[PDB]
């Protein structure tokens, strides 16, 4: 159990940032239970306090601990009113761990996730692994001969007249700041 089990404080003062698949904080580091971002959104300091206060009160110092998986607010906002921390879909906002089962932390993590600015979910190591396995399984066993990548990459049907350059990389999974899970 880390000595500083409780969440630390966050300093108030130190378009594509949330428009694609995440490349950071996508893997569990120390904890087993964490909140997974399912969309792109900006986390201002107010959200940070809600996560800090709610999680700290419930967690047991003897058996539980938590850590932050995202940087403090650094991006300027003007009417320099305040700074917002960008987050990409797939990021782990906060990580929890300890000699506890997922079910114990499900309620608090899910409650915290609901109040986040973007859609989010509470996932353990197993659940995150299961989600990826299901995604790969769906792609392999898909019975639709046509897929977004092949049509877009090969410019079949003259499709690229109606597509953005970024669409080829995303392959239709991501539209704007929203992530479509079922879309293979």
């Amino acid at each position: 159990i880390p000595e500083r089990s409780k969440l630390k404080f966050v300093e108030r003062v130190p378009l594509k940032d949330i428009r694609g698949p995440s490349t950071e904080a996508t893997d569990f580091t120390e904890g087993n239970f964490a909140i997974l971002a399912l969309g792109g959104g900006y986390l201002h300091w107010g959200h940070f306090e809600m996560m800090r206060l709610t999680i700290n009160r419930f967690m047991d110092p003897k058996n539980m601990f938590a850590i932050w998986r995202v940087p403090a607010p650094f991006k300027p906002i003007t009417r320099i009113d305040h700074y917002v921390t960008p987050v990409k879909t797939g990021c782990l906002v906060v990580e929890m761990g300890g000699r506890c089962e997922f079910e114990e932390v499900k309620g608090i993590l899910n409650q915290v996730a609901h109040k986040l600015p973007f859609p989010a979910k509470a996932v353990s190591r197993k659940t995150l692994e299961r989600m990826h396995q299901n995604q790969r399984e769906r792609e392999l066993n898909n019975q639709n001969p046509w897929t977004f990548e092949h049509i877009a990459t090969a410019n079949m049907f003259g499709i690229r007249k109606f597509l953005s350059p970024y669409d080829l990389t995303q392959k239709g999974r991501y539209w704007g700041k929203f992530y479509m899970p079922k879309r293979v």
Binding site: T153, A154, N155, M156, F157, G158, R160, K161
Partner: protein, 120 residues
């Protein structure tokens, strides 16, 4: 919106593809039958030009072209507006005598004897 370069993998066939379309990877066919089946209106200007270069100004009228890389390069530009079918010569190339008796079938066969009579 700019011209696109298709990855080379698109034009590398697979063993099942040869089975489906019935074309041997060896002894490749010589001549294409190309017909325009979509309109050049609302298409970028480069597509409009290649269609005129290939002679496919009228739709649903077939044109014969060489199955050589330079011709193929233009065809790849307008792949979506045309239908490419391999010309077949069941009875061989037309000679001087048979030049006036030919007919191009929908199947892709240029028959050199056209009688308009029951097969019997």
């Amino acid at each position: 919106f700019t011209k696109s370069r298709i990855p080379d993998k698109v034009f590398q066939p697979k063993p099942e593809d040869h089975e489906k379309y019935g074309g041997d990877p060896q002894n490749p066919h010589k001549l294409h039958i190309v017909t325009r089946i979509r309109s050049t209106k609302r298409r970028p200007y480069w597509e409009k030009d290649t269609i005129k270069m290939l002679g496919l100004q009228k739709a649903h009228s077939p044109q014969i072209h060489k199955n050589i890389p330079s011709v193929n390069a233009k065809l790849k530009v307008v792949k979506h507006l045309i239908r490419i079918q391999p010309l077949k010569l069941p009875q061989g190339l037309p000679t001087e005598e048979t030049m006036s008796s030919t007919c191009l079938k929908s199947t892709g066969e240029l028959v050199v004897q056209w009688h308009l009579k029951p097969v019997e």
